[PDB]
Amino acid sequence: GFLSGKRILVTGVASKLSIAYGIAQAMHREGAELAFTYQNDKLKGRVEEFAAQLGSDIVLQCDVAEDASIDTMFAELGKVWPKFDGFVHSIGFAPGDQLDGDYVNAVTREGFKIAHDISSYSFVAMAKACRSMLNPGSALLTLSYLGAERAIPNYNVMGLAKASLEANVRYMANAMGPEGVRVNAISAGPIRTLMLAHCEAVTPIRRTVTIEDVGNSAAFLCSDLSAGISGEVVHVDGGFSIAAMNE
Amino acid sequence: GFLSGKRILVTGVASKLSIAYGIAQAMHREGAELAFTYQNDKLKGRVEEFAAQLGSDIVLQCDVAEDASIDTMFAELGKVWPKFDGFVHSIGFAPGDQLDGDYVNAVTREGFKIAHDISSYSFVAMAKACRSMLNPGSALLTLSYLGAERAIPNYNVMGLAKASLEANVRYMANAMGPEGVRVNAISAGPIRTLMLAHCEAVTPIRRTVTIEDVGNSAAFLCSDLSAGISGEVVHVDGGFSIAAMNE
Amino acid sequence: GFLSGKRILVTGVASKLSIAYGIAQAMHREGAELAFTYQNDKLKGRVEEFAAQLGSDIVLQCDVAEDASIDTMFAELGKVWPKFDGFVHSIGFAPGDQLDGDYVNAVTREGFKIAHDISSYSFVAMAKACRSMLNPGSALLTLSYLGAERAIPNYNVMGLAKASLEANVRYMANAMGPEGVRVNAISAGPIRTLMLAHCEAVTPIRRTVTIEDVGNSAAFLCSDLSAGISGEVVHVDGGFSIAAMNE
Amino acid sequence: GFLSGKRILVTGVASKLSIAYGIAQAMHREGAELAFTYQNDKLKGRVEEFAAQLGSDIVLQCDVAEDASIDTMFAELGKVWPKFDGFVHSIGFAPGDQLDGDYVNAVTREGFKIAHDISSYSFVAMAKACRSMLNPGSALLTLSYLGAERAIPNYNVMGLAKASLEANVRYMANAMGPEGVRVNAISAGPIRTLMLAHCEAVTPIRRTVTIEDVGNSAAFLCSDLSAGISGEVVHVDGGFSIAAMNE
Ligand SMILES: NC(=O)c1ccc[n+]([C@@H]2O[C@H](COP(=O)([O-])OP(=O)(O)OC[C@H]3O[C@@H](n4cnc5c(N)ncnc54)[C@H](O)[C@@H]3O)[C@@H](O)[C@H]2O)c1
Ligand SMILES: NC(=O)c1ccc[n+]([C@@H]2O[C@H](COP(=O)([O-])OP(=O)(O)OC[C@H]3O[C@@H](n4cnc5c(N)ncnc54)[C@H](O)[C@@H]3O)[C@@H](O)[C@H]2O)c1
Ligand SMILES: NC(=O)c1ccc[n+]([C@@H]2O[C@H](COP(=O)([O-])OP(=O)(O)OC[C@H]3O[C@@H](n4cnc5c(N)ncnc54)[C@H](O)[C@@H]3O)[C@@H](O)[C@H]2O)c1
Ligand SMILES: NC(=O)c1ccc[n+]([C@@H]2O[C@H](COP(=O)([O-])OP(=O)(O)OC[C@H]3O[C@@H](n4cnc5c(N)ncnc54)[C@H](O)[C@@H]3O)[C@@H](O)[C@H]2O)c1
């Protein structure tokens, strides 16, 4: 497929319901050689199973909250893939407390800190650590949400974290482009499995999107077919965002 | 390929350098079956040639300035492709006088009318005419330019026509989505074959995008791989638009 | 007030409910000297009457569909005001059949042409005709609607016309900037006096904006207080546009 | 003036060159009652002087890095102003090492933490603290920059923090709107005093904005004249942002 010959590190696979699983499958379907990371020991077995299914042996633990963990993981990785072609960053977190009720009341300095650190900085931290291992024509990709652009009830601080992320994309595309590295994001709509009857009613295509839809777009965005696209945030929400007062 | 089994009508092929030729070429490469239109008596020959180069015998005349020409064209195509699934709109024009010098001094009522008529209305005109022939999961695509979003010297009235066009994409996407049709646009950067060294020094990827770059993105957007995307204006300009003050 | 010593032309006053009446009032309150246009002879006496309340006796007829009517209006106006400080463009029109139902079905070539011509071209047509009469420090202002940025049911082809208009604002701002003229737009939210319950429910400030809200904004934009703002589309919709899924 | 009757707290006056100085001055001029804050001991002197200069005896210390200092500052302010009408947030910081060269090589986890903490969280942190003291009709305002929207060389991590800020503005506006509070930002262009040759040449108004221009917009935005504007980022850069390829 259009990714054959590409070596992509995939991040954030927690379940087969997870957006990253969908991204992995599509990428694998298109011919990519994949690597996986997992946050904690509890996840390892699971990740290992999926990886095999997808023809992979490369399963490394990585906690993006710690710079060491990051450096370690990419040292191990270089033993198998001394050069590779990018990675998919599908990681986000904010303390659940932050995610309910009045934003002004909910928000805290630490909650603010963590959300931003995990949800946005980790992206550039990862890029910082593997910069010399990336091949010309590599592509990095993260996942975002409408919440970065508009105020959405309860999304609260995550919204701010996502806005920081989408700016990280532009600053990374600008810095890394001259070395043949592309950086994009996908702003995904809400996914039925992983309000919605509102979303479906109002989304132009009249359905919510699927991990498959998201996965297909991600594959395209990490392949050479999208070589003229960098620093972009692509909406994969079935047009949900460009419609208004859809009675 | 990812377009196997799709019938796509391509408009505005007028030369081999043309953006539309790059689009036709990539689609063909991905398995699509093509049909072509040509504006006037003059081009028939060349177009007949290119078509044949891309395995097509469907070459029909179409002058978007006229309602009957479009209706007639679709009547003809329907003899051959009673159902199809989508069309690429790569048409635009402003009288040359409109395009040089101070925007306010250059613009005229007639130059304005025409620019908007051919460059923007024509897109919905075609949709309107083949609406019943479109298969569920069809995709419509048009071509745009940064001038729609920023004031660009000399782009003048064309900047206004492209803005209108971008809105058209949104309005069309919202109207046709419920029936299974997607509508998007590509905002392409300057193309070399088709200042350039400033543009390159300032584009993150450091080069101008090519008609291949554009054709590849177009193919994706017209394929089911992009089922989750509608009403979107995708920038294929190497990240030029998201940078500022680069030097 | 902050408009004292400024001479401003106001178009589109048809009633006391009209946004332009609202704007005229507020500007007059801040000390501007006003002049008015009216479209047809039927409107004449009502306008003369309002103008009188606002200390003006300059009431000229003007149909923006006619170049000649514009030129004639400014000729006449030049007799009293050989030099002035800007105008307020508050005119938009689309054949009513255009504004009901599925956009693709309702839109026609003539409807599209008219909507664009009256609603967008008229803005630059007026600028072009009075360019030499503007003082350094002048300001031009037009009115837009969220429909230019998102697909709104029934707004249909007016959406494309507002989009062409917002781009017209950027191209004019760029062309006229160097001679001391600023150009901007206000994107006004729905006005109760000009669904609304859903609107109020979802607007952050929890009420619809008023023509007073709009007028005060227009007044600021036309004053030297906004000297650092040109080419902008300012949203006066109480934050309606920056929120999502508030329902 | 149009601010007569209001009590506004002003942060970040560090000099007479400060954008914060230009705002206070303008606000003072429009008849507002001012209070001031200062970061540390060294400033007190300067600050106490400007305040005097603007008829204020209210000078309180505040280090936004600490929730403690903020709570206290407002405790103290409630002694003189038990209720007040909003504040202007003119605070930004990132370590200097962060702001030089390749963003990817420059950024650090700590440097990113600080920048977001001081430049973005501080804003909602103050709102949270004085929420109870705000009169209906209050207005909060913050200062931004183009770096939040586009990738600007050397602006680096500040661009991500400004992006977070602009989203904060939307979430704060959506949350506080229902109790009568409006929240907005100004995105100011580069200011000469406090390349510029480049900028001027390419800024539609052909000059860089001044602290007075910014101050005038801020005053309007904090007054009741702008009661219809909330959740908005107004660009006060002479239109710099909306032009492109300006030859
Ligand atoms: N769920 C949706 O509707 C939706 C819509 C748009 C975008 N997204 C985005 O996709 C990503 C999350 O994926 P998802 O929504 O499929 O859910 P998910 O729960 O499967 O994804 C989160 C993943 O992040 C990992 N993670 C969290 N903190 C980590 C840390 N410190 N170190 C290492 N890994 C860590 C978890 O282990 C997990 O696998 C985010 O970027 C989110 O904004 C989700
Ligand atoms: N040139 C650039 O840098 C650039 C960048 C982005 C977008 N574009 C877009 O590309 C398309 C133009 O194709 P291109 O750039 O390959 O070359 P081009 O400038 O030759 O495209 C114009 C095409 O429109 C056709 N056309 C014009 N008037 C017509 C009429 N009345 N009826 C029927 N067909 C008519 C012409 O025959 C021709 O094929 C447009 O969609 C334009 O917006 C150009
Ligand atoms: N009503 C709303 O909720 C809203 C919201 C945002 C923007 N606006 C905009 O404000 C302007 C109109 O004001 P309004 O909406 O208060 O209602 P309106 O119906 O009173 O505005 C239209 C005005 O345009 C004038 N006009 C139309 N065709 C003309 C022609 N050929 N020559 C000269 N004058 C002509 C009319 O005489 C009239 O005064 C438009 O630009 C419209 O898009 C309205
Ligand atoms: N410099 C420009 O051309 C420009 C253009 C647009 C926007 N801005 C914005 O205006 C604001 C600052 O104005 P500026 O750039 O003229 O001056 P600046 O860069 O000196 O602003 C920093 C100010 O923040 C204060 N500050 C820093 N850390 C603090 C802390 N821990 N607690 C309390 N106060 C602290 C300082 O005392 C100082 O007054 C920022 O929000 C910035 O982004 C500046």
Side-chain angles (χ1 to χ4, degrees), chain D residues 12-14 17-19 39 62-65 89-93 118 142-145 155 158 162 187-191 194:
Chain D
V13 178
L17 281 228
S18 280
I19 281 202
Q39 202 208 321
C62 195
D63 195 334
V64 286
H89 174 275
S90 186
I91 301 173
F93 171 85
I118 302 323
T142 189
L143 282 259
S144 195
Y145 186 56
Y155 196 56
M158 266 312 301
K162 292 297 201 184
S187 173
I191 287 172
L194 160 87

Side-chain angles (χ1 to χ4, degrees), chain A residues 64-65 67 102-105 107-109 113 116-117 121 128 131 147-150 152 164 168 170-171, chain D residues 64-65 67 102-105 107-109 113 116-117 121 128 131 147-150 155 164 168 170-171:
Chain A
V64 297
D67 299 338
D102 177 288
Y103 166 59
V104 177
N105 287 344
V107 66
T108 70
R109 173 155 345 227
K113 199 164 250 109
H116 283 69
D117 174 56
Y121 177 71
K128 216 185 208 291
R131 190 166 198 186
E149 295 178 24
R150 322 257 240 258
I152 289 176
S164 185
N168 212 354
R170 301 185 282 277
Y171 278 87
Chain D
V64 286
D67 294 341
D102 188 89
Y103 162 64
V104 180
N105 288 346
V107 72
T108 74
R109 187 171 314 242
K113 217 156 265 169
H116 284 69
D117 181 47
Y121 182 70
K128 202 208 246 291
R131 185 167 198 174
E149 297 177 36
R150 306 221 194 124
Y155 196 56
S164 179
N168 206 354
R170 303 185 278 270
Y171 277 85

Side-chain angles (χ1 to χ4, degrees), chain D:
Chain D
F2 58 78
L3 273 185
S4 285
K6 294 276 183 165
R7 267 144 183 220
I8 307 286
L9 163 69
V10 178
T11 64
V13 178
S15 149
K16 199 212 46 179
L17 281 228
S18 280
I19 281 202
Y21 181 84
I23 291 150
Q25 195 178 329
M27 297 211 154
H28 178 51
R29 198 195 70 229
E30 289 304 333
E33 285 205 304
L34 305 179
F36 282 90
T37 81
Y38 59 99
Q39 202 208 321
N40 66 40
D41 265 315
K42 324 144 167 214
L43 280 304
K44 198 165 179 224
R46 224 139 357 149
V47 181
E48 279 189 353
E49 188 170 21
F50 306 135
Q53 201 191 90
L54 315 171
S56 173
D57 207 1
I58 315 184
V59 180
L60 310 51
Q61 182 263 347
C62 195
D63 195 334
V64 286
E66 304 179 57
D67 294 341
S69 167
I70 299 166
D71 287 318
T72 287
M73 185 273 289
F74 275 118
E76 286 207 302
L77 163 70
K79 283 193 199 142
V80 279
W81 290 357
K83 296 284 236 234
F84 70 114
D85 315 286
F87 61 84
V88 167
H89 174 275
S90 186
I91 301 173
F93 171 85
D97 78 288
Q98 290 305 283
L99 311 191
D100 178 51
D102 188 89
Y103 162 64
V104 180
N105 288 346
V107 72
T108 74
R109 187 171 314 242
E110 199 55 67
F112 169 114
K113 217 156 265 169
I114 286 168
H116 284 69
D117 181 47
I118 302 323
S119 319
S120 176
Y121 182 70
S122 52
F123 188 43
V124 60
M126 290 172 57
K128 202 208 246 291
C130 70
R131 185 167 198 174
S132 279
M133 312 165 49
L134 299 163
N135 282 322
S138 304
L140 310 193
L141 179 79
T142 189
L143 282 259
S144 195
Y145 186 56
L146 198 55
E149 297 177 36
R150 306 221 194 124
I152 297 219
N154 306 300
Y155 196 56
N156 303 353
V157 75
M158 266 312 301
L160 282 61
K162 292 297 201 184
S164 179
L165 223 220
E166 294 194 7
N168 206 354
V169 164
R170 303 185 278 270
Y171 277 85
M172 289 168 67
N174 188 46
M176 298 177 95
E179 75 222 25
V181 183
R182 285 187 302 104
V183 175
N184 291 291
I186 280 171
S187 173
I191 287 172
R192 202 169 90 244
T193 74
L194 160 87
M195 105 97 104
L196 312 141
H198 154 251
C199 207
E200 294 184 59
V202 309
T203 303
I205 65 165
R206 293 279 191 298
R207 39 171 292 235
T208 76
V209 303
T210 66
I211 65 175
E212 327 317 300
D213 289 321
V214 173
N216 282 325
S217 294
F220 160 77
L221 283 176
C222 280
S223 92
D224 288 334
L225 284 182
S226 56
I229 308 175
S230 191
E232 187 92 336
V233 175
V234 179
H235 296 77
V236 185
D237 66 354
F240 175 80
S241 96
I242 56 78
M245 298 192 215
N246 224 70
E247 73 187 32

Side-chain angles (χ1 to χ4, degrees), chain B residues 187-235:
Chain B
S187 178
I191 292 183
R192 216 160 224 288
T193 67
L194 215 38
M195 177 211 97
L196 274 182
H198 175 245
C199 193
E200 307 163 346
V202 167
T203 302
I205 64 164
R206 289 309 184 262
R207 46 169 272 245
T208 45
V209 304
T210 64
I211 73 171
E212 284 79 21
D213 280 331
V214 178
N216 282 334
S217 284
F220 160 70
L221 294 178
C222 281
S223 75
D224 300 327
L225 281 189
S226 59
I229 310 175
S230 189
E232 187 87 342
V233 177
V234 183
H235 298 75

